[model samples]
Target: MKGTIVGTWIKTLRDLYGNDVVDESLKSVGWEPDRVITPLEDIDDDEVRRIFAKVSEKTGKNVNEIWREVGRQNIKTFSEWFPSYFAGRRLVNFLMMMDEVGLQLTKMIKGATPPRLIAKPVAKDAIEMEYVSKRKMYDYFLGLIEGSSKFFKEEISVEEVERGEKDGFSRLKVRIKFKNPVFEYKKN
Candidate 1:
């Protein structure tokens, strides 16, 4: 995984859990307490898991809970670093463009496999989004969606339509229903 995402995770961990938990987590992983991950640096995926596992041990919170919280809070870090992505856009529009954004962000990095966020409108106020990745971070994905709704001041109901692994890929399909209609019929 790219350090950009992992770095944001570290920051979000500190924000959500606190400095002590993050410091201890890093120390347990043989890293400096104030370690900084550069954006383009490549990090082993297992390293991230190990750190989070330590965080789970220290805080008595499961790894999934940690990931979900990080996903929800990481938006603040992302928005601070990449304001243009969230600027002047609603949650639906931001989400629909995520695949392209992921591609663009990782285009320069060799062997980088960004998750595919394919979203389609299913109703006047709903969308069905498919999350496909090898990482299987569905909890984080759901958290991000919830975070986006909060950031945009939108209310939404999310239903998990499917979740499983097939052919070495983890797939999660979710139905997100918004409080307000985001689509409208147009006269032909």
Candidate 2:
């Protein structure tokens, strides 16, 4: 995992649940409360898991829910820091560009392994978005989708199609149905 994103998650967690909770959680994982996470640095995913686990235990909330909230808050943090990605874009367009953005990040940053967010238009009103990665962060993925809709003020229904792990990689398929038709109908 990239430290940049992890750092944002930590900050958002602290903001959402107070510094005491965040500090205790970090301490449980033997990590400094104010560790600096540089963009080019890679942090172990297990360390993140331990931190979230301790936080979840203390708060009596499911770890998945914790991750979802973190993901939702991330949009605001990311937009504030990098406005170009969110500027002049609707929710659907922003989501469609995410796969490309992951690729671009991998190219720009050394050792950055952002998950693949492949979105394919299945109908004039929907898209089949597949989340594929070695690191299975499904909760975060769903939260981001929901956050996108909220940010753009668009209504959308997301249904899970499948979820499984194979060959040390995890895959999740979802159908995202938009309230307003995003693609024009073409006569075949």
Candidate 3:
């Protein structure tokens, strides 16, 4: 995984669970408490898992819960780092653009395999979003969608359409219903 994403996870952990948990978790993994992960650096995926496992053990919370909370709070960190992505964008637009944003961000990294977030408008007030990746981070994906709505102050309902692994990839499809119409049929 890219350090950019893993680094954000570390920051989110600190922000959500406090420095003690993050510091302890890092030390448990034989890393310095204040270690810095450069944006362009590549981090072993196993290292991330081991660190999170330590966090789970320390916090008494399962890994899924930790990931979900991190995903929810990571939006704030991401906004601070990349304001342009959130600036002047509504929740629906932000969700729709995430796939392209992931692609652009990881394009420079060699062997980067960012998850796919393909969203399509299904109605004036709803969208069908699909998540595909080798890493089955469905909880994180759902949390991100929820966080986007919260950041934009938009109320939304997300229903899982499907979830399963095929071949070597994990897939999750969800229907997101918004309180207000975000799209319209325009004859151009």
Candidate 4:
């Protein structure tokens, strides 16, 4: 939340000392003599690091200390900016839906061999997700599976059910089985 951090810092400085101290401090950093603080909409994490370093140098404070103080002071701003990466939804629901979306989009594109999605329960605690792919789409098919796991914050044990040319077609057929019933639950 680099964009939000700058706003937080401006407010913190104003509240802690006063406008004079904060304004002059901003000026001392080669900022415009009457620079107006702009609310940033979006920023990369690297920019956040650089901004924090600048603030640290200006205030004679460690970046960690600045971060802790900023974090303490700007809870509401943080929420306003980066709300609920995984807040309201269950992990299972997000992942299964992501899988579907991934498949749907891939199938719509030219030169896409969207793998077949087969899910079957081998035991009460585990289910298998199989991806059947022809030669070209293997990479995208596997990438989507890995991405889905990461996005959902859940782990699955992936196994290769079959690979290589079989039945007159050279292809990959990978099966991933998860040891949790989370995927089977209905989303509300």
> Residue-wise lDDT of candidate 3 within 30-133, one digit each (tens)?
88999999987888888789989988988899999988888889988888887898899888888898899779866866767889999999999999999999
lDDT of 1: 0.88
Per-candidate RMSD, Å = 1.5, 1.5, 1.5, 13.8
TM accuracy, model 3: 0.94
Per-model tally of clashing residue pairs: 0, 0, 0, 0
Better of 3 and 4 by TM-score: 3
Pairs of colliding residues, candidate 3: none
lDDT of 2 by residue, 10-120 (tens): 888887788999999998888889888887688998999999998898888999999899878778877777789999999899989999999999999888988888999
User: Which stretches of model 1 miss by more than 4 angstroms?
Assistant: 186-188
Q: How far in Å is the alpha carbon of 159 misplaced in model 4?
A: 1.9
Per-residue error for 165 in candidate 3, Å, reads 0.4
Computed on alpha carbons, the lDDT of every model, listed in order, comes to: 0.88, 0.89, 0.89, 0.53
* Greater-lDDT candidate between 1 and 3: 3
lDDT of 4 by residue, 1-188 (tens): 32344665566645544576566655655555354444444434454455556666767887666655554344434334545634576544544454475478456644334345656555544555555544333443555455455555667766666656666555555555565654345567
TM-score of 1: 0.94
> Per-residue lDDT for 164 in model 3?
98
TM-score of each: 0.94, 0.94, 0.94, 0.36
